[PDB]
Amino acid sequence: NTPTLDSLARDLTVIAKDGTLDPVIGRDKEITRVIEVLSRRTKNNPVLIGEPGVGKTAIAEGLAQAIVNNEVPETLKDKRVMSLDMGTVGEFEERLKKVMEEIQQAGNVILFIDILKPALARGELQCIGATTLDEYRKNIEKDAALERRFQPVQVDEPSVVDTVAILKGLRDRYEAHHRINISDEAIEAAVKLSNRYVSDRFLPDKAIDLIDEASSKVRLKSHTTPNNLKEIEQEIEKVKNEKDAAVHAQEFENAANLRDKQTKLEKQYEEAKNEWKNAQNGMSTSLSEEDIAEVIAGWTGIPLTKINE
């Protein structure tokens, strides 16, 4: 069960087994690419070539997701996924010698990195690199032993259409708290303008940025009371505090009227609240395209009139 690897790193099959995180949507193309490289006899160490932030983290997350879903092939069946973070880096070399021994004996441990030359030369460790392109051509290419052992994988930003399916797939997972209705028009409109203005962090992280504070002026805006409960609740507040003072002051001449008034106001508050929600829960507050572009107006400073065309 590789106890050393389970304590010095983070296991991915345990996290994916519960499925408490959002599923990886839109990276289905890379799912078949990672397993394909691991099945090759030569160069069975794929490397996530790309800028840091393009979505390389989701590539490793989706690899262990197929194990629970029984979508991985027989060659990659029932194999745990282990990732070693760079923040736990002499005595440093004394720990990596024991971890590699357990991987060879088990035969189902897949390393994930973000000394080891003899280990990679024999292909004993099937580590998956995650270094950027700039650092891959400076430390890995300069060494001939690792040149024929690490197979670069082109992991770049997805297409515009591919990002659209991400929002639709996760839409059902975004409505479970207040049961609101989201229009389908805002889904396609959240990817056209995303690349127009924000083009400095690549897809899909820069793509899903328009729907953060775009259309939020409809649903709860009508849930307010137009000078209805602003005064009813205030009357209840003053009666309660004044009632307690009259008890200790031996003044029950006016306290008797206060109790009846307070009870009547409490009944009225419940009736007013019930009628408010009954006439509003039936209607649905869907999104509108006229307010989607309002959030991007303040990100860059472009006037809303110029954007709304």
Residues 164 to 193: which contact ligand ADP by CB under 6 A? 166
The answer to the question of residue 242 lying near its own copies (CB under 8 A) is: yes
Measured CA distances, 75 to 67, 82, 120 (Å): 12, 17, 20
Q: Which of 133, 164, 229, 255 binds its own copies (CB under 8 A)?
A: 229
Closer residue to ligand ADP in complex, CB, 27/79 = 27
Q: Which of residues 200-239 bind ligand ADP (CB under 6 A)?
A: 204-205, 208
Q: Which of 122, 278, 282, 283 binds its own copies (CB under 8 A)?
A: 122
Closer residue to its own copies in complex, CB, 4/202 = 202
Closer residue to its own copies in complex, CB, 28/124 = 124
Closer residue to ligand ADP in complex, CB, 58/67 = 58
Task: Find the shortest distance in angstroms from Cβ 89 to its own copies.
Answer: 19
Task: Annotate 45-63 with b (16+ C-beta within 10 A) or e (fewer).
Answer: bbbbbbeeebbbbbbbbbb
The answer to the question of residue 54 lying near ligand ADP (CB under 6 A) is: yes
**Which entry of ligand ADP, its own copies, none binds 25, CB below 5 to 8 A by partner kind?**
ligand ADP
DSSP, residue by residue, 172-238: GGG-SSS-----SHHHHHHHHHHHHH--SS-TTTTTTTSTTSSS-SSTTTTTS-SSSHHHHHHHHHH
Residues 84/113, Cβ–Cβ less than 8 Å: yes
Q: Which of 28, 32, 73, 199 binds its own copies (CB under 8 A)?
A: 73
The answer to the question of residue 27 lying near ligand ADP (CB under 6 A) is: yes
